[PDB]
Amino acid sequence: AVGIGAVFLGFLGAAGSTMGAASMTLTVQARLLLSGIVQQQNNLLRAIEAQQRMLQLTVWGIKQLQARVLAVERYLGDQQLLGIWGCSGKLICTTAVPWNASWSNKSLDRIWNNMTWMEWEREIDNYTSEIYTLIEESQNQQEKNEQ
Amino acid sequence: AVGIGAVFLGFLGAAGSTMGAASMTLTVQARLLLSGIVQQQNNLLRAIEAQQRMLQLTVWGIKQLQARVLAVERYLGDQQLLGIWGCSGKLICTTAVPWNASWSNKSLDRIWNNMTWMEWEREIDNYTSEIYTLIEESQNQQEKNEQELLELD
Amino acid sequence: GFLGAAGSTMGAASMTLTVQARLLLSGIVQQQNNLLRAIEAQQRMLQLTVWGIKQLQARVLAVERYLGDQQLLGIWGCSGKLICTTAVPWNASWSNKSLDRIWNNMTWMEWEREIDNYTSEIYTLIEESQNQQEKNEQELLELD
Amino acid sequence: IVMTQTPLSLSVTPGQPASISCKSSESLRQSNGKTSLYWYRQKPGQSPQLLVFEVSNRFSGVSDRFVGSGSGTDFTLRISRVEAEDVGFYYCMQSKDFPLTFGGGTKVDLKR
Amino acid sequence: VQLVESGGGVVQPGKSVRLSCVVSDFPFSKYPMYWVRQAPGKGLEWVAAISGDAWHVVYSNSVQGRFLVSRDNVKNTLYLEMNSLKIEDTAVYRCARMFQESGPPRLDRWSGRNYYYYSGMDVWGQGTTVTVSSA
Amino acid sequence: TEKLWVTVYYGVPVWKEATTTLFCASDEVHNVWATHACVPTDPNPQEVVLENVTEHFNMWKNNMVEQMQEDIISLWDQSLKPCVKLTPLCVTLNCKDVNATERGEIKNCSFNITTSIRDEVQKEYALFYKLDVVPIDNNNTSYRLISCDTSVITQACPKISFEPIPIHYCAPAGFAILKCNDKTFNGKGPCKNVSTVQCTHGIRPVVSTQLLLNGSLAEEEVVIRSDNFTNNAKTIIVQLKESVEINCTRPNNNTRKSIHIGPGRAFYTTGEIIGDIRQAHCNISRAKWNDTLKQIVIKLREQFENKTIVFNHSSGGDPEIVMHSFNCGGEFFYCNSTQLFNSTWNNNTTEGNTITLPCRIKQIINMWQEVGKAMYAPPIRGQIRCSSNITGLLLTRDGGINENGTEIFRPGGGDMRDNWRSELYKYKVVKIEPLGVAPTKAKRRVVQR
Amino acid sequence: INENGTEIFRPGGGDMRDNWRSELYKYKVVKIEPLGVAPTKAKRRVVQ
């Protein structure tokens, strides 16, 4: 017999937003990047570790190691990128690169009040590459300029 | 033969120490969340590398891989939280979240003067997750959004 | 492969440490590895094979090194930044040499040969002074 | 942690091979991956002369006729072509742990 | 290298002496030193040891608490003080230098407590004799 | 000023020699060398030249060699694991001389081997080479196979080929491989023109002895290396400045024949030889070979005063260690290298212009001399045609002397791990440690008290 | 065997797990949890 309380919005609940509102819960999203079993999770975690004691199996067992390592690496890849950009902490980090209207020129008001992150992804996907490069150059020049 | 010097605190040295003083040994604990084979030696590293190599083809090597990966996950499991909160270490940090007495009313003169970390820990086990979440939203809410707006001209 | 500074003395090398800036690898290499991580699905279907096993172990090792090196910077209160300072008086017990000689006519690597038995302690004093103490002093100020 | 030696005395002629045996009751391996056991000699009025150290690593200024080896708990010397000058008292010393201790002591001499 | 002893003689039980050793030809402060003991017509006996930095020191059980060994790294000398001598302490005492020099005490960061390394010996002095008893 | 403070630098140029696991990299079947299991390579490195430094190298201590040998041995196991055991075939059989119109080299054998567990008579025909069998009971027609008494014979999977393929070894992040680019190098000592790489230059794996096939060439001049030239117990590796073409072939056609010994147990042999039985052989320019030796001999004297330099054939015996050996396209050829080593060059100074050198084929191979594990290789239906480049020699010097001021050098070695040494002689593995400390100037900047 | 009081013992056993147990008895394995929180009398000083 289990009762239910209130939110405390959970994992990906923000998808319904609306980027204006999506600035909230950034922690809710990020916090679960390294675990689908967050918390002690009695009667789960115990079995999770028990299973890893049973890794005398080959092929199958090792696939789980691959998964774990790739999870770690995926995480760390992002952490390195943020380090490079000077965004070591944390959620929101502004740069000194001015937005190139070539990428998009939709009203700021349209963006934050009537647009969803998923859409935004689709819209500027093709420019991601060079956006990142430019951000790097900013921090590079800042390394030297701040001298 | 081998002769011996002196502490230099030591691993878990503050385990039974009153929290007030134990709070100043955080360097020791943090230093060793990736170890037990510290310093070159320098035969221990040589041996471990030799077994890590030789045993790469068998289950026992796999079990070492298992353990090593585990260590890393546990480490990053804590670093993630410290990153998310405005507490990039820094061994300690403060939040904007006000202590809700529902969790514990106990006086600071009892806490910091006659209680170990473990005794204290027993008392807050069930409120850990709640406390974290409140820190998280406090971090984001305003301290980051309004912060952005504080540079808005 | 940022070892260009190896051909110089510590002075000079110290002007190029910030020039290096861009990680010794990883970063964009990990981005290239992302492309390879997609390929890993093929290498999953592949099944368990030697080279595959070695690779897995190689990834683990690489990561372990990265984090170990990073860890200390965090604990030291220095983070990074490539150059930071700490309030630990240079105990002359470790060494006693003119700064001109220490920075000039001094290959960085060679210098390390003479610091190794002291590095261990040096880390300790950094820890237990720089962050152990200072961390409190900020809180202690904030108490008032 | 004791250490004993045999023979008590050894009478060998110039050019004759000879040996010295020293056994430890305790393991001699050191934490650096090597054993902690040295040998040396002294004549009446003289002081110990390091002969060999770390078993096989003989000391500078010592003839190649001096060799030795053994297990992780005991070691022996062998002296080929014993010279007339090679008389006197020989000891072994365990430095694996404190207190430092010595073998029983052997006397090498000539036979006629 | 130069390694000589100084300050031997004969005393009565309960008396004390300060047997010193004077050395040269090497970086004295980087060499831990030994005192060894040979009773007349008998084998060798280690007595005491003192670290290169003169911080660490150990004694044999039979002398522990009665002997006190010190250092002067500036003057290149050892000082073996021996208090409350017993008749059986009658013996040849000798100053010796460690074979393998140790660096600074290796500190392990997992409660290492600064370890000191000790090894064999390579230079024995001449030695002197300290004799004990009333007549 | 004179009060000094600890400062911390990250990304400092300090490295230490270390041992780590090499990381295989590369560019419709799998092959013994499944290089598609290795990671797609960097199309364009990323190599760095270092300034003003030297590094000590030693090609007879570098354990990359040991790792490679380990690796290949284990790879063979991974190709041979899921394949057909040939234990049923170890029976007494009778065989006749093939009407070849050499002379008994190939024999047409027949055997009664119950295939299914059922009660069956199964007289089948199969072809063998002289080297594959042992005669039974003196003057008789009965034979057994050469390795059955001690070893299990496993058939190499038909769909898995030898196929040597270019392999790279990268270092995992945090590691880097130093490379001596200092043209001309005796294999031991300080190198000056040192660079560093994220990964090695391509190495092709090869199973061979006495002659090095398809390796890398020296930059300018022929070079000779040896751990200790005065010690004849040490081997000598010679790397050529310019390779020498050698061609080989199997001049007939063969019919594949399968024999269904049992469940999932298809044994393969040759059902018929089509065309005349001609001896498998190789061809090499006599002149080219001669002139290379000239150059080598010069270097030999540079190492050894001015002596009598001799090239003789090896001591004789076991074909596997005595004859020249190589795997061409899944087939194994053994040749008589004497033709190449039958002369002297003791001072300033025959038949045809090219040397044709015949060889033998052996189907049962004892790779790496592993007692207990014998490998069998199936026929590939004739038309065998290969070409290769001799790029270096594995020579040894005769022990003792005949007091004539004579040094005799002969095809030798025998330890395949030297094959690797001839490619890895430039490389060294190190690891980099970013972290370091340094004195004043500077200060933390804190509030007291 | 309660019929006459006294106690009766036999050189029994049950598994080699006790053979191990006889030397492992005083050891524990403990997971370290490095992160914890506590009340203080300090603000963060976020500007608002």
Added chain:
Amino acid sequence: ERGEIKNCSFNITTSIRDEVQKEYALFYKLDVVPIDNNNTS
């Protein structure tokens, strides 16, 4: 005592050839179980 070690006397096919080798080796009583009552088998 008696019946502590027995010396057989067994039949074995060597490898795969027409050689059923009569061969002998020593065994301890604990290793073996009698066949056909008290027969020597």
Added chain:
Amino acid sequence: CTRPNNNTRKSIHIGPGRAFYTTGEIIGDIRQAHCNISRAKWNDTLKQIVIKL
């Protein structure tokens, strides 16, 4: 503890890489294996044990 094991090995070929190792012959007085305990101290041990029991 001891065992009058003065015997020699015998190798018997069974098959491919199959060398059967056994005992060829015992050469000497065949006595039964056994241990020897001092009693005394053993009994004293028991005396300690029963006290704790």
